[PDB]
Write a protein that binds this ligand. Structure first.
Ligand SMILES: [Zn+2]
Ligand SMILES: [Zn+2]
Ligand SMILES: [Zn+2]
Ligand SMILES: [Zn+2]
Length: 601
């Protein structure tokens, strides 16, 4: 194991000062904080750990307060001695998920600068899909060393200990090992991150600079009106009771709204075709098929939809209000998606229905504080613009070039008719293709979304490829380079490794190919969105305007802008986002404002 002999436990200033001096001259050093909580805004710093060299690390406990805890350097004294080093941009730090530590120090008025390396992001850029990018998985994968787990020193369940309760030396082993391991992981990973300029560029100019901006976004939080969320809940309880009555009324007797059990014996037993509807789902939905004429399945649909949304947002959100800030602080995960896109949880802002009335009501509960307004800056169909560029198709490119609706423009070409006369059915068909292309969907899968027969979908696709040849070429060239080199890249060099590309397996290899076409567009959107965040944050930081970047969901950045600054600020956000990112993709940023996220959205 790791004993109390491996790492020093700093209990006196003199020794801390000695270490600080060595740290000032180290080329890089692993830094890490221990706290009494995962909640960043309310966590108290319990200790700090540093690693100057592999095997040379220390734990500085400052707030262990269990029964008879030995004297420790006070948190304040330790922080005033460490502050210059932490605030020195020239002092390069390495750490596992530094976003977290930057916030903790910020709880003490300390601005963690020199956030050079994050082993989590190191691991993520090298290969996003290689596995989990947490330190335990990292240590094992790269160093064949199994780190002391948090559960090993803290325990489990409700009776788990918070860091300040753990014995100094136990805390020390765990803490100092993390710092040590982090530095080693960096030393193994950093050299590798250089074998390829692409990943290197992404890591250096996209992922790393994003670290403190995510911290800032998460910590700013978002204002949610619990009252509105509650009224919506009550009302929803009423709509569910009514919708259930409407179901019982359409048929006879009572029943749960559970298919393949209660519905089959009702829906098809009163005429309809035997197969149910898998809640497999976004391809086969016999419930909404019947919905265009049959009334019952349509209400079972709307019932369940509201049922999920209520327990998930209406009921959960108010419970997420942080007592300290009175705001909701979402958790962004920077090293989770295969494509490089930021994901979000507690709450998962992306799963809030976009085109739906209830989802719209959810957003209304995201409000701007007094004298501020919510401002939504969105990249209009960036993934489709990226494809226009990646496919070098004069047609699409010109469509975006002259501000025409690419879905109507696409339909006007596929079906061959004036742009003014393209009907809604045509536009919806062209749209299904356009968005079907990004996800690399097969002609049969396109038919499943448009309700047209197979080969009619194919007829639409061949016509598309004929009118938009460069799209097929891009698609063929990407599936090609995916097999040849086992991965695809984004414009910035971000890589998605496709291990099942030459799978010899049917669907598994098919998925790898879909992923091959998709990732370059999704990944590029991801990079751009990240570059805009860094760009906008830099301006926020440098110019200190009356604005807070509060969210990032899908392809939009949401802020709180002071009501009297809305115009100047919107002109400025808009320029940063579409002129200070990639100058190659034809970008457009839709900026909107309102009293809440829905109005600005
Ligand atoms: Zn940490
Ligand atoms: Zn740690
Ligand atoms: Zn998109
Ligand atoms: Zn513009």
């Amino acid at each position: 194991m790791i004993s109390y002999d491996n790492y020093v436990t700093i209990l006196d200033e003199e020794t801390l000062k000695a270490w600080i001096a060595k740290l000032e001259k180290a080329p890089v050093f692993a830094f890490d904080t221990e706290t009494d909580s995962l909640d960043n805004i309310s966590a108290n710093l319990v200790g700090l750990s540093f690693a100057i060299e592999p095997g040379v690390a220390a734990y500085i406990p400052v707030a262990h307060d269990y029964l008879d805890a030995p004297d420790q350097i006070s948190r304040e004294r330790a922080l005033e001695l460490l502050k210059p080093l932490l605030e020195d941009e020239k002092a390069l730090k390495v750490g596992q998920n530094l976003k977290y530590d930057r916030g903790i120090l910020a709880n003490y008025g300390i601005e963690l600068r020199g956030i050079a390396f994050d082993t989590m992001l190191e691991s993520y850029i090298l290969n996003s899909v290689a596995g989990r990018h947490d330190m335990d998985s990292l240590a094992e994968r790269w160093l064949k060393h199994k780190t002391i787990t948090f559960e090993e020193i803290a325990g489990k369940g409700k009776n788990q200990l918070t860091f300040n309760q753990i014995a100094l030396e136990e805390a020390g082993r765990y803490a100092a090992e993390d710092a040590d391991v982090t530095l080693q992981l960096h030393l193994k990973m950093w050299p590798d991150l250089q074998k390829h300029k692409g990943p290197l560029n992404v890591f250096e100019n996209i992922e790393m600079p994003l670290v403190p901006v995510l911290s800032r976004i998460e910590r700013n939080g978002v204002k949610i009106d619990p009252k509105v969320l509650h009224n919506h809940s009550e009302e929803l309880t009423l709509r569910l009771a009514e919708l259930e009555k409407k179901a019982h009324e359409i048929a006879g007797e009572e029943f749960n709204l559970s298919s393949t059990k209660q519905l089959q014996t009702i829906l098809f037993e009163k005429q309809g075709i035997k197969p149910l509807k898998k809640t497999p789902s976004t391809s086969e939905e016999v419930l909404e098929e019947l919905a265009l004429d049959y009334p019952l399945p349509k209400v079972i649909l709307e019932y369940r939809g509201l049922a999920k949304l209520k327990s998930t947002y209406t009921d959960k959100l108010p419970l997420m209000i942080n007592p300290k800030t009175g705001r909701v602080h979402t958790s962004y995960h920077q090293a989770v998606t295969a494509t490089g896109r930021l994901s979000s949880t507690d709450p998962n802002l992306q799963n809030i229905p976009v085109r739906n009335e209830e989802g719209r009501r959810i957003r209304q509960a995201f409000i701007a504080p007094e004298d501020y307004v919510i401002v939504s800056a969105d990249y209009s169909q960036i993934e489709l613009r990226i494809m226009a560029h990646l496919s070098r198709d004069k047609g699409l490119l010109t469509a975006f070039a002259e501000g025409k609706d690419i879905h109507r423009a696409t339909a006007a070409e596929v079906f061959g008719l004036p742009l003014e006369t393209v009907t809604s059915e045509q536009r919806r068909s062209a749209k299904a293709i356009n968005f079907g292309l990004i996800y690399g969907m097969s002609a049969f899968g396109l038919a499943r979304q448009l309700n047209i027969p197979r080969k009619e979908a194919q007829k639409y696709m061949d016509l598309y490829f004929e009118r938009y040849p460069g799209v097929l070429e891009y698609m063929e060239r990407t599936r090609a380079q995916a097999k040849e080199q086992g991965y695809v890249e984004t414009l910035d060099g971000r890589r998605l490794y496709l291990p099942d590309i030459k799978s010899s397996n049917g669907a598994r290899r098919a998925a790898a190919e879909r992923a091959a076409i998709n990732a370059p567009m999704q990944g590029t959107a991801a990079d751009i969105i990240k570059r805009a965040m860094i760009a906008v944050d830099a301006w926020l930081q440098a110019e200190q305007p009356r604005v807070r970047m509060i969210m990032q969901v899908h392809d939009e950045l949401v802020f709180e802008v002071h009501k009297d600054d809305v115009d100047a600020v919107a002109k400025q956000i808009h320029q940063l986002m579409e002129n200070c990112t990639r100058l190659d993709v034809p970008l457009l940023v839709e900026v909107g404002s309102g009293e809440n996220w829905d109005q600005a959205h």
